[model samples]
Target: SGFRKMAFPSGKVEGCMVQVTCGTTTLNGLWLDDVVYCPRHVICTSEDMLNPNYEDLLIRKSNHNFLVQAGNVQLRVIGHSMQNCVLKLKVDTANPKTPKYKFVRIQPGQTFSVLACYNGSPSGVYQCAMRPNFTIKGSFLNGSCGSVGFNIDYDCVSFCYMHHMELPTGVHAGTDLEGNFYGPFVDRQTAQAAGTDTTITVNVLAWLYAAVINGDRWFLNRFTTTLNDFNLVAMKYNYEPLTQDHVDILGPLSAQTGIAVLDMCASLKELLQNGMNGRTILGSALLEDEFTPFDVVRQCSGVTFQ
Candidate 1:
């Protein structure tokens, strides 16, 4: 995957002026509440001389920040505060050895592109520390030289979802909050008799599509695991599992606002059963995206009628 630049808003403060400095570049501005800033990559730090307590020095990671990319990582700092602070970036590798760290100087309203490194291996989290030790008022702040810190763990969520949960975790995956499996269960006699394929596929698509739109990472993994197990079953029955074509078909429908479960299933079933092509249509409609010979015993009463 490519690199992603994470943007962070300026830090918050009260009864104190904030400034940031990095080498020759400086940003000086009046203290304001809730003002946001943008940097392609940077750890935003803030300090309050008026309240020189250690906790008053706020350090937070950006929403999009990451410690590792495909094989490299980089971090810059945007320090804005009245106190002189030290920003440090550290990386913990997969090996059980000491982590490497680097320190950079930052003053109020100054932009410091301080931290940069490349991970030799594909595993590590970037650890950042902001230590406010000196004040603009010509004195060292009263506290230990300890620092506030944040960690940018590698982007392994998607990786684990695909490689671990979907594969090794078995059918116990993709269970919804309502205790319903996304795909058909293999042990239910009633399920085998009632053709649980359409039911499972519809519900799985509805929730999976919904999860992506809602940005529910938890549900996203669950539904995906369900589909993974579902695929094994579909394959046994000579049916195709939900693939790109199914995703293409359901993406637009899922994106629509306020779609009921019933209508969504009807549309999907209709497309697979009545679409133009023969194999693509009949194969998908008759054999693809269904539960295996296993009898499903889950409580997906939610999508049964739909």
Candidate 2:
């Protein structure tokens, strides 16, 4: 089990001014003027750490684009982050084919998820992470933003599971999202200086947590049948499997975990001495990290079918 925090200074930004204050633990990623970024499922605060006067606003990344919501007025974002100070974002439309995540090879109409083991924080936090490119078993039929709709639940430990909806909008729209793009941080002088809004923290989740605090929560349901299904997520270090071991060991955890396809928050387990694959795996395919420390996972503590 490892808890490593990779520090990525927030990059330069060009949006409104926003401030996200947490009681004790807040992330350091999201950017308006300083476009700081975090690549992992950065940790965050729940209803507990937030200020009562303000509400939450969330802008979620779908592949390469985003889905931003301010009540019923939802914005299917083929764009970047732009929120007003009080938690409202302005708009400027750009064709979805610009600045794609050129490095990623994800094809159109295809989806993928990355699973990692949980890690620790301080200089920052990585938490246990499993990121889905789209909704898993939870798709609902609607015309609101697109022809078909999807919902996801970001499963993380130590706080609440972050949830959001990514309407399968614009599927046939662009060159295919060169999505999950990020940049480097500002220098130490700017960081130590702490200008009005340029205060990037040592923690990568700092602004990521702030972005969640600055936004609200939403979810996507798949096919409506919903694989918000259930099984305990796994914890063992990724076993590359040996020829001596049965190939059956390399498969998804179980129907209780993930068989036909993984759930929203899915993961693989270890085979020998193996109780590590016991965290309740949700039917939704939202999260599953490959690097989180076993001791740091929420699933590692309880034996419930959450």
Candidate 3:
């Protein structure tokens, strides 16, 4: 919903040079031992490159689904990097296609405002590889073609809890290593005090519950196979937060308690409920972000999350 930026330190080799503001977001590494993880709608810059002309190169060798969350978080490389550096952007084209434009790009112009969005769409992710063989090159250094390579993919670590609401995959409760920076919080209580807590128990069904708990109608509807929208103010006026649609789906779902879908859902529900209530911070306000575990599940299900 908002924006942030990360600047490569002029002369330092550290793990996650610090969004100083964000969390353990790794923004590619060079002449450094650690990688910094970044959050959504963030633009990372290497303008103060030690070797301005010896720019590094980034080629997204792999492809990922472009739409993961409502305007998925975009990791933008702008401003400057070795002048000759190029950060490539690409989009996933497999079908179940919802957004007409494969990706959103704002060229160097007036419309490319210094905001966290492009073309009316909020910032999501982009790793462009126009041609199958094409590679984006940037950040010049050393002798290896005056280049570096980007081969990449965070959560509520430290800064995440402070800035956004995302949690890295597999971890729904407690703080990950990201909390080391602020405090050595290991569980919900410590987090409640310093940072913090989790266990196996989760996916889709859990997300639905959280969406309802958070009053997120958009998220709950993505998995709905029913003919009606999760909400009715616009879809049908089914104004209630939880309705027959939710029941119809979950009811049938619960009946299959032995299947993996239900099993996984049940597990995820446990993880989410624990996180929502006991582990991750709750009723707290963020000044932003997403990539909830449910979003991952939805994306994997050949669909998108809102």
Candidate 4:
């Protein structure tokens, strides 16, 4: 699956540092002045290749054998290329262990094995890419050569699948849907970049603590005033087909939505310190009778059975 070539210059040489003393094959992949050759080594001998007619080729060669050199070592990464490799050595020892990849998004107090597909590399290397339909994309940095960094190519197949899949933590379904007041969103960047004219349809999961009068029937226009921006999350009360008492509860929810905004601001204040975007959803009552602990009461025991 590759090509090879050979070149020769049959003329007098001058000011040369090294010559193909015996096996001209050593010059195959050698870069000029780099002096790097595999299966061979350069000894710090006083021999000079300038006067080739007078210098003894035999004496100049034996001193630079790579295997005989002191402190020389080679470590191989064997897998499908970037996956795994069983190293062999003459002067080195193999530290038998499974390699690990580290990523930026791996949160503290969590651990799991991520599945990935193998993607081919430009440098003829290979890597295990995350499975899109299986789990979330774990951003682990693999390695870098010079200024060029190398890692699992997220753009490969299943990239979109991985992003939309269930969370690796398995603590919740869908995205970051948990005890937060509002939605965290499927893609934070997409929500932030959209202008005022654009409307984003997001899939959100809501839970309550207490049971109210037809509690789920409370018509509330749920707005996620989670932080600086007044982004609308979704309108919800109860999706039940049966008729309930709090059918037109949207007004109360929209009017008192200010509470959710306040809570979001407080959380943002804390998150911004660590350079993180804290996202949350807010809720409020539809009418202004009194800021009853009803919502709080609803939270204590009102969990949806469906």
Q: Kindly indicate the candidate among 3 and 4 with the higher lDDT.
A: 3
The C-alpha RMSD in Å for every predicted model, in order, reads: 22.8, 21.4, 20.1, 24.1
lDDT by residue (24-96, candidate 3, tens digit) is 1122211111122222112223332222222221221122311122123332322122111222222222213
Compared with the true structure, model 4 gives a TM-score of: 0.15
lDDT, candidate 1, 1-306, per-residue tens: 111111111111111112322322222211122321211112232322222332232334332232322212222332332222222222232222212222123221111111111111211122111111111111112110111111112211100000001211121111111122223322111222212212235324444333333342221111123345545554554333555445454544444534433344434444334443443221232322221111011111211210
| Candidate 2 residue lDDT tens string, 1-306 | 112222111111112112222232222222222222221212123542233222222333232232332223333333333221112222343323122111133211222221111111112112222222222222222111111111112321111111122223321111111212111211111222111111111111111222122231122123211222212212122222122121222222222222222211221212123332443222223122222221122232322211
Clashes of each: 14, 70, 39, 30
CA shift at 278, candidate 2, in angstroms?
A: 11
User: Which candidate has the top score in lDDT?
Assistant: 1
Candidate 4 residue spans exceeding 4 A from truth: 1-73, 76-92, 96-306
Q: By lDDT, is 1 or 2 better?
A: 1
TM-score (C-alpha, index-matched) for candidate 3:
0.19
lDDT of 4 by residue, 98-161 (tens): 1121223222111222222111111222212122122222432221100011122222111111
Cα lDDT over the full model 2:
0.21
Q: What TM-score do all the candidates reach, one by one?
A: 0.18, 0.18, 0.19, 0.15
Q: Where's the lowest-lDDT run of ten residues in candidate 1?
A: 156-165
Residue 240, candidate 1: alpha-carbon lDDT = 36
